Design a protein around this ligand. Structure first.
Ligand SMILES: Nc1ncnc2c1ncn2[C@@H]1O[C@H](COP(=O)(O)CP(=O)(O)OP(=O)(O)O)[C@@H](O)[C@H]1O
Ligand SMILES: N=C(N)NCCCCN
Length: 402
RNA sequence: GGGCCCGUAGCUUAGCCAGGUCAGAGCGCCCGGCUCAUAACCGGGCGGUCGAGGGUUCGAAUCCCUCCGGGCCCACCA
């Protein structure tokens, strides 16, 4: 007998699968043909700005030889090897040898690595593996079996029947709101009571019927029963880093701010908020690094109404990814609020010269602002996987748009 | 005491000094859409009679007259 971590990534298509499904089909066979799969499989999300999830599951077979073969099959039948955007990869790391990968995984969640850095690893520990085509999978693969989970969450992922593949998903929508209604926060980020959307029911080719996140088996269990939906074929719970901010980089730990990575910076507003056709807002804040601009895009919705209130001077904390040199707000902290006054010519009942008063002074008044200090985030429909929703953070000044 | 600018939908604005698609647009906004993808025009829609008052003219947002509201500059007195 042997304990071994299986890891899979990049296997679906722009019309194929959900890599998580294959990992389940691989689990099914392993569970009835080689041994026993231990605990819940993990769905680890890697760097989200990559030019993205991976799966892993700890098994216990008698013979790793066969183990590989089996998981290779599923990968040679239920995997879209046709498309060119799909280059699968598989790893089998001995239980012990897991932790010794946490770094490599950390590096593939917060930065950008090339296939070599992954081969270099498989080599350092001579790790049984499966490359297909380019096998750019082997990156996520390892990463998935090395991802550290200090803070984690769960996700109940349901799948439809193969024959019901392609059809538009039916479900008594409303049953998810009765849902969110009584478990929340417990089960969360599943719906948007504001933008009126049921965010956990994808509209893709993947067999994924629904997908409910929460913080406990208890909640997920109650939830799965409490909701009306089309027949559920398979169903599995995944431990994930979903909603953990496990990709942000602290400004207190890097000199430059490269593109394709996520951070958390503090700064003063320099250039006021503004729009562009599309509802897209922008504003430049001053920082330790220098001139850094922030985007508060439209899908961000109800967030913009908060972003536009920022005035030159305000001290704020921006949470987001850096692309096009801009930091895409996932959330923002209003540290201190800068006061702003306005000048006006007095009246009897105007200006008469450069130095020749009017009275002598101009009417200076302190206009009260509305925007207020605290943590503001983007509403669920706009939620990013890794992005940690505030309902989870323990800090004050939280404004949770449910 | 004189010299100016500026005022079009809730905002920010094309048009205006070459007066005859008397109304374009972006944001917001109401309503929908999209997402396993942070996302640099996603859609429609309501909405203005062009600061007010008057004159010119077949005709004015558009040229002219003044007023209100903002707001600026140069002299001068002392
Ligand atoms: N840090 C990183 N740097 C570079 N490539 C990375 C990376 N982390 C992951 N990758 C690679 O990016 C590719 C992701 O492909 P997929 O896994 O198909 C996207 P997915 O999001 O997993 O597919 P899906 O959208 O159907 O869920 C894989 O090659 C993965 O190994
Ligand atoms: N709750 C989920 N399973 N998914 C919600 C994703 C929302 C952003 N697409």
């Amino acid at each position: 007998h042997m304990r071994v971590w299986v890891g899979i990534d990049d296997t679906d298509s722009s019309r194929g699968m959900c890599t998580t499904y294959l990992a389940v089909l691989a689990m099914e066979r392993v569970e009835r043909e080689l041994g026993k799969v231990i605990g819940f499989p993990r769905l680890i999300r890697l760097n989200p700005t990559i030019p993205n999830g991976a799966v892993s599951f700890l098994v216990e077979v008698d013979d790793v030889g066969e183990l590989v073969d089996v998981v290779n099959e599923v990968i040679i039948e239920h995997a879209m090897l046709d498309d060119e955007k799909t280059n699968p990869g598989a790893v089998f790391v001995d239980e012990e040898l897991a932790v010794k990968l946490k770094p490599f995984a950390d590096k593939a969640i917060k930065d950008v690595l090339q296939i070599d850095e992954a081969l270099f690893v498989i080599g350092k520990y001579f790790i049984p593996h499966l490359r297909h085509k380019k096998g750019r999978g082997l990156i996520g693969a390892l990463a998935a079996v090395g991802a550290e989970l200090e803070d984690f969450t769960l996700e109940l992922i349901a799948y439809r029947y193969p024959e019901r593949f392609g059809t538009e998903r039916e479900y008594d929508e409303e049953s998810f709101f009765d849902m969110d209604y009584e478990l929340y926060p417990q089960t969360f980020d599943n719906v948007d009571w504001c933008n009126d959307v049921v965010v956990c029911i994808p509209n893709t080719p993947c067999p994924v019927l629904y997908g409910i996140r929460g913080e406990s088996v208890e909640a997920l269990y109650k939830a799965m029963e409490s909701v009306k939906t089309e027949p559920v074929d398979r169903r599995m719970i995944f431990v994930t880093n979903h909603a953990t901010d496990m990709h942000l980089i602290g400004e207190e730990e890097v000199h430059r701010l490269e593109n394709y990575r996520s951070y958390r910076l503090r700064g003063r507003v320099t250039l006021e908020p503004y729009d562009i056709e599309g509802g897209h807002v922008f504003f430049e804040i001053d920082t330790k690094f220098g001139s850094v601009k922030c985007a508060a895009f439209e899908p961000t919705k109800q967030f913009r109404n908060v972003i536009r209130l920022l005035r030159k001077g305000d001290v704020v904390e921006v949470y987001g990814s850096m692309k096009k040199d801009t930091i895409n707000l996932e959330k923002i902290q209003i540290v201190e609020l800068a006061e702003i006054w306005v000048e006006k010519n007095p009246i009897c009942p105007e200006s008469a010269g450069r130095g020749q008063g009017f009275a002598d002074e101009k009417l200076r008044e302190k206009v009260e602002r509305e925007l207020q200090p605290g943590f503001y985030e983007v509403p669920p429909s706009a939620r990013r996987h890794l992005s940690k929703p505030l309902i989870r953070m323990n800090v004050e000044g939280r404004h949770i748009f449910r």
